Design a protein around this nucleic acid. Sequence first.
RNA 1: AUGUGGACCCGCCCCUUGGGGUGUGUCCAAAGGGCUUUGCCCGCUUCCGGAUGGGCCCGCGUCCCAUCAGCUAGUUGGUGGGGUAAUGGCCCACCAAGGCGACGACGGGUAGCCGGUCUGAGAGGAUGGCCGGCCACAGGGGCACUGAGACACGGGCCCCACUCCUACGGGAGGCAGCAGUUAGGAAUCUUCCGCAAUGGGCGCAAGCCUGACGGAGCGACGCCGCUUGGAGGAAGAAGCCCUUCGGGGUGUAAACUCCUGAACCCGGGACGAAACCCCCGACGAGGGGACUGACGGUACCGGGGUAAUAGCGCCGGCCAACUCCGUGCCAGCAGCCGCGGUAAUACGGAGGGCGCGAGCGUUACCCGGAUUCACUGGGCGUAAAGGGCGUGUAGGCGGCCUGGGGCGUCCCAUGUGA
Lengths: 208, 84, 138, 125, 100, 99
Amino acid sequence: GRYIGPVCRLCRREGVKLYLKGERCYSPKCAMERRPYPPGQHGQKRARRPSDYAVRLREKQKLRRIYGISERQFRNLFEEASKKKGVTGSVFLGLLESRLDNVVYRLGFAVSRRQARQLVRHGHITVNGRRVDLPSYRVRPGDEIAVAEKSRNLELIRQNLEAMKGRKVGPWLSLDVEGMKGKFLRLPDREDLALPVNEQLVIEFYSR
Amino acid sequence: MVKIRLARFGSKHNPHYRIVVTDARRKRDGKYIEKIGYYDPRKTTPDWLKVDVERARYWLSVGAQPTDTARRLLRQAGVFRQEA
Amino acid sequence: MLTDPIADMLTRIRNATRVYKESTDVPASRFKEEILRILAREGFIKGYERVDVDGKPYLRVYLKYGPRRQGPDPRPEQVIHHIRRISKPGRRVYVGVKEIPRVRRGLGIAILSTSKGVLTDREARKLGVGGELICEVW
Amino acid sequence: PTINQLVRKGREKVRKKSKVPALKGAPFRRGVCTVVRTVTPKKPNSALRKVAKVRLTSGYEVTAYIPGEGHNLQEHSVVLIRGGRVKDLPGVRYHIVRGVYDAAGVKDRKKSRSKYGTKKPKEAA
Amino acid sequence: PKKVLTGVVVSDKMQKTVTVLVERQFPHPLYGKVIKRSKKYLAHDPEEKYKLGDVVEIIESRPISKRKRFRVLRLVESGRMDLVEKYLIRRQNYESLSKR
Amino acid sequence: RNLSALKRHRQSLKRRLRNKAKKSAIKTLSKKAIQLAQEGKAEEALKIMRKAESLIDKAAKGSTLHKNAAARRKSRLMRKVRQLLEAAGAPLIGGGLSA
RNA sequence: AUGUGGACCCGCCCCUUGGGGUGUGUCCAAAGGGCUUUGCCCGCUUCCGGAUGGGCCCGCGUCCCAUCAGCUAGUUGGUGGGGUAAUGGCCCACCAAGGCGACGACGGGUAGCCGGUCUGAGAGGAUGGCCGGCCACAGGGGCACUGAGACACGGGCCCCACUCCUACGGGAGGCAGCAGUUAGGAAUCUUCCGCAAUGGGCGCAAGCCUGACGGAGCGACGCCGCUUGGAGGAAGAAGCCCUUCGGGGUGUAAACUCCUGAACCCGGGACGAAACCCCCGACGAGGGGACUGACGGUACCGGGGUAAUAGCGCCGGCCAACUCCGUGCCAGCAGCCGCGGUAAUACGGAGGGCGCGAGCGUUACCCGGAUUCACUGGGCGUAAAGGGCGUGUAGGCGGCCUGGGGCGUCCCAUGUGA
Ligand SMILES: [Mg+2]
Ligand SMILES: [Mg+2]
Ligand SMILES: [Mg+2]
Ligand SMILES: [Mg+2]
Ligand SMILES: [Mg+2]
Ligand SMILES: [Mg+2]
Ligand SMILES: [Mg+2]
Ligand SMILES: [Mg+2]
Ligand SMILES: [Mg+2]
Ligand SMILES: [Mg+2]
Ligand SMILES: [Mg+2]
Ligand SMILES: [Mg+2]
Ligand SMILES: [Mg+2]
Ligand SMILES: [Mg+2]
Ligand SMILES: [Mg+2]
Ligand SMILES: [Mg+2]
Ligand SMILES: [Mg+2]
Ligand SMILES: [Mg+2]
Ligand SMILES: [Mg+2]
Ligand SMILES: [Mg+2]
Ligand SMILES: [Mg+2]
Ligand SMILES: [Mg+2]
Ligand SMILES: [Mg+2]
Ligand SMILES: [Mg+2]
Ligand SMILES: [Mg+2]
Ligand SMILES: [Mg+2]
Ligand SMILES: [Mg+2]
Ligand SMILES: [Mg+2]
Ligand SMILES: [Mg+2]
Ligand SMILES: [Mg+2]
Ligand SMILES: [Mg+2]
Ligand SMILES: [Mg+2]
Ligand SMILES: [Mg+2]
Ligand SMILES: [Mg+2]
Ligand SMILES: [Mg+2]
Ligand SMILES: [Mg+2]
Ligand SMILES: [Mg+2]
Ligand SMILES: [Mg+2]
Ligand SMILES: [Mg+2]
Ligand SMILES: [Mg+2]
Ligand SMILES: [Mg+2]
Ligand SMILES: [Mg+2]
Ligand SMILES: [Mg+2]
Ligand SMILES: [Mg+2]
Ligand SMILES: [Mg+2]
Ligand SMILES: [Mg+2]
Ligand SMILES: [Mg+2]
Ligand SMILES: [Mg+2]
Ligand SMILES: [Mg+2]
Ligand SMILES: [Mg+2]
Ligand SMILES: [Mg+2]
Ligand SMILES: [Mg+2]
Ligand SMILES: [Mg+2]
Ligand SMILES: [Mg+2]
Ligand SMILES: [Mg+2]
Ligand SMILES: [Mg+2]
Ligand SMILES: [Mg+2]
Ligand SMILES: [Mg+2]
Ligand SMILES: [Mg+2]
Ligand SMILES: [Mg+2]
Ligand SMILES: [Mg+2]
Ligand SMILES: [Mg+2]
Ligand SMILES: [Mg+2]
Ligand SMILES: [Mg+2]
Ligand SMILES: [Mg+2]
Ligand SMILES: [Mg+2]
Ligand SMILES: [Mg+2]
Ligand SMILES: [Mg+2]
Ligand SMILES: [Mg+2]
Ligand SMILES: [Mg+2]
Ligand SMILES: [Mg+2]
Ligand SMILES: [Mg+2]
Ligand SMILES: [Mg+2]
Ligand SMILES: [Mg+2]
Ligand SMILES: [Mg+2]
Ligand SMILES: [Mg+2]
Ligand SMILES: [Mg+2]
Ligand SMILES: [Mg+2]
Ligand SMILES: [Mg+2]
Ligand SMILES: [Mg+2]
Ligand SMILES: [Mg+2]
Ligand SMILES: [Mg+2]
Ligand SMILES: [Mg+2]
Ligand SMILES: [Mg+2]
Ligand SMILES: [Mg+2]
Ligand SMILES: [Zn+2]
């Protein structure tokens, strides 16, 4: 299934913070403020001018590794996005964010995407009042994401929601911190969220 | 003779019969003469049935033949009420 | 012999402009003029006067050229950069109002003969016709 | 060529010669060994490559390469053909699949085991 | 509608029957050059009146005989043995292509 | 080791032997008229031709002859007899012919 | 017997290919069974329409080899018959000598065709497997019967081959139906459940059969969804790697601490079913009532509830990923270029890294890149390519003006393109 194991190593393989950890990948480092260089025996060694290919390969892994999603499910989206009209590139991340496990990470229900999956998977997440244990679930305008009763407790939820006070939500989201409910207002244009990822390089990598 | 019956569609454990007019010697999911509505024996849709009465009774005026189960729907669809 | 008159003219022009000159002639033709009639109205050239060459009626065609550029090769830009025959006598090209060309995304013109006279890539679409696609110019 | 010529002659369609006929078109082909020897290679290279003359189903008999280090193929050995030439070895355009019939995989293989038909070994105990 | 064609006559050596040679211009599906074709029909002529050179017409009809499903319609201009010339040469020259 | 519908065949024989015998008659009987109408005897012939017409049209009550069959028979029959008798003969009984 | 009507001969009328009608002659029909019977129902009979399903014929389209160039005696047309639902040289007589072919006849080779499918910017190229339409076949051939319809998979006759039973004194059989066996093969499944649903046949109706069908079964064969966990966690253990012995790497990875907790346990439990049928109204309409689930107590719902499979390929360049050792043109890798000769990022192992993930690789085949058959979209002085040179056949191509025709070509409209 999904990826499992060393992740701070990725945090620094791409050479950029991506906060796949909760506190740590967000504390003093993804293990990087310590060692901001690539893993493996050949870490402290100079790099060779990355080829136009390796650049698009790296800039791609980056994005996919961010949402922690298999190359399967991943490319399926790009193709579906590419299928459309307008810009696709922008449309792409649109379909990325619409994921259930994603909404949860944003709506602070969880700190990490990988923590957000465990939630959705185990069935401690809701959608318009439905048990949706499928992280693949795509969400649209006005969808309500709350917690189930059997779960509206758990010493781990209150912490996550609590930390969400003193923090804001995306211009495309809205959280009822005190109620455990949130809403997907709209599809967030490229602007609505900035990232170390130049989509246009990901578009190129797919036109081999 | 020419009959009016159900033709399985959709998938396994998920019927979506097409009601249609065709020869009795054709396969139930074969080439039909004219489509005239559908039906969802699961009731999982507001449009779990539909008929073109103007076009349905026509085949009856030319001498069609509905199933014992296709009747049910046809009768319970408001196509048999003679009226006056 | 001239297996193709139209083409001969187009080439007669193409060969003049390449060397820059004020005018080159060409044997008279009802169909030939209706073609030049397009180039004048489209400004691809100046005009022409049904001149005469030894009893034989020709058509002094007048060419326009851009402004005298400077530096290496002061020769001006071409008003008619490119022109080639499409529907030849060895292969006729017929298109309907829906199959009409698209020269340089509008920047160019296309000339075709139809049941409604000598038209343009546009007029054909406007009139709603279609016929033998003569050539292309830009 | 004038367009007229094209309506007369037409453009002939290329066609393509199969580099692995003995296979008869299928991916693999069960066979039987006849002679097992070692042959000096060609070109700038040098060695004693392990090959096999194989009598197969389709009444064919072709030379087949035996990949890796050390094999267990005698005269009446069963085998399976793969397809794909060697190069250094002129006149031999077929490899042998390991760990099939009478072709055991390379023993003590730890790297690319997908080929060489070696199964995953035990780590510690 | 019953198919209708215009062709010329090249044979009448059949009791009651004549052979009509038709043509049709149409663009090549791949090269678009306007090309010609040809198809000899066996025209039914009960009152054997039409002769060679008769640029006539024919209509799709019920089976008269095997190979013969076309009756004659009308004349279009008799006295044209000139077309029957280039046709006669063709078959004439087919004795110069023999692989012998 | 079979089915009982083997009847159908076991029956189909009777129907066979039935309309086979019915038909051998028409042939030999359609001859009578032909031979006679060929040789003058218009009277005696034009009573066999009415009969013939019978057996023919009668046959159309089963799966023997049918469709335009009996029609094609007569069509050629009571047209052939009239042509024969036309040579000499001279009509005697239109009993079957709307002359 | 009856003839409403139908059938055919002739004349006549209209139309006009045997369509309709007329007159006259002759020929042609039937079936009863059950009753809440004395009135309905279930059927019978001939006809003219409806509908549906066909048959036949025609135009255009439909691969490779001209290193197949000439083919044909029912052959082509005729007359007249036979034949069929009916046209036809389909069949048979006789008459005439025709019919076909470089616009590729005849011949050999390959192939079931289409909707579609795959690829491709496109045009094209490749393909016809599941599903749907058509065709053809039902051990190899021939044949006819019955019938509305078959020349009939599970119908019949005959020949052939093969196989089986036998008290051999003689007979039987046709899986390309569903499963299964066997051989062949690189390789493709249960000798399963159920007629509950849908469809089909028979019947007044209950009801009956239904390996069609609805399902279940086996195979990562495919696509899709899902898991082997999550947070915290060291200036970052041990072990294993390198190392200039200072140190660097695996590495938050583990451990460890909390959190949830797929599976499993218990209870509950389906939608899929409603009609036919029955009562009322006349069995019409309507209303009401009742019946039936194979899948299976399965999906799903509650709650209890355990941290729980990770493998494969690559890291010389194309092409993403580097070091040590071993090896020493040996053993070996290899799509191409090429690697190995005692310092190998290319062999073999290790450490580490890149790429994927219940998959990862390989082989084979189709399109792509190949614009490398070039219609879109190429060439021939020297790179492959101008015939040794003329004459000329067919063929392709063709000058200025004007008119008829309007084939090509173009517009609109409509049908068809399920
Ligand atoms: Mg777009
Ligand atoms: Mg691409
Ligand atoms: Mg049918
Ligand atoms: Mg009902
Ligand atoms: Mg009767
Ligand atoms: Mg019969
Ligand atoms: Mg009439
Ligand atoms: Mg009676
Ligand atoms: Mg009784
Ligand atoms: Mg048929
Ligand atoms: Mg005849
Ligand atoms: Mg028949
Ligand atoms: Mg005939
Ligand atoms: Mg005839
Ligand atoms: Mg004869
Ligand atoms: Mg030639
Ligand atoms: Mg031709
Ligand atoms: Mg050819
Ligand atoms: Mg052949
Ligand atoms: Mg075949
Ligand atoms: Mg196709
Ligand atoms: Mg497709
Ligand atoms: Mg495309
Ligand atoms: Mg296409
Ligand atoms: Mg094909
Ligand atoms: Mg198959
Ligand atoms: Mg099929
Ligand atoms: Mg068999
Ligand atoms: Mg039928
Ligand atoms: Mg049968
Ligand atoms: Mg049979
Ligand atoms: Mg058959
Ligand atoms: Mg059978
Ligand atoms: Mg058996
Ligand atoms: Mg089977
Ligand atoms: Mg099997
Ligand atoms: Mg075997
Ligand atoms: Mg199956
Ligand atoms: Mg059933
Ligand atoms: Mg039923
Ligand atoms: Mg019944
Ligand atoms: Mg049974
Ligand atoms: Mg069964
Ligand atoms: Mg099934
Ligand atoms: Mg599976
Ligand atoms: Mg496998
Ligand atoms: Mg460390
Ligand atoms: Mg370590
Ligand atoms: Mg962790
Ligand atoms: Mg617990
Ligand atoms: Mg219970
Ligand atoms: Mg029932
Ligand atoms: Mg009711
Ligand atoms: Mg009810
Ligand atoms: Mg349960
Ligand atoms: Mg539970
Ligand atoms: Mg664990
Ligand atoms: Mg790889
Ligand atoms: Mg690659
Ligand atoms: Mg690299
Ligand atoms: Mg070497
Ligand atoms: Mg050497
Ligand atoms: Mg290797
Ligand atoms: Mg070394
Ligand atoms: Mg070296
Ligand atoms: Mg390598
Ligand atoms: Mg190595
Ligand atoms: Mg490694
Ligand atoms: Mg590495
Ligand atoms: Mg694979
Ligand atoms: Mg592409
Ligand atoms: Mg070209
Ligand atoms: Mg070239
Ligand atoms: Mg040249
Ligand atoms: Mg040279
Ligand atoms: Mg040369
Ligand atoms: Mg020369
Ligand atoms: Mg020459
Ligand atoms: Mg020569
Ligand atoms: Mg010459
Ligand atoms: Mg000439
Ligand atoms: Mg000409
Ligand atoms: Mg001209
Ligand atoms: Mg004109
Ligand atoms: Mg249209
Ligand atoms: Zn981190």
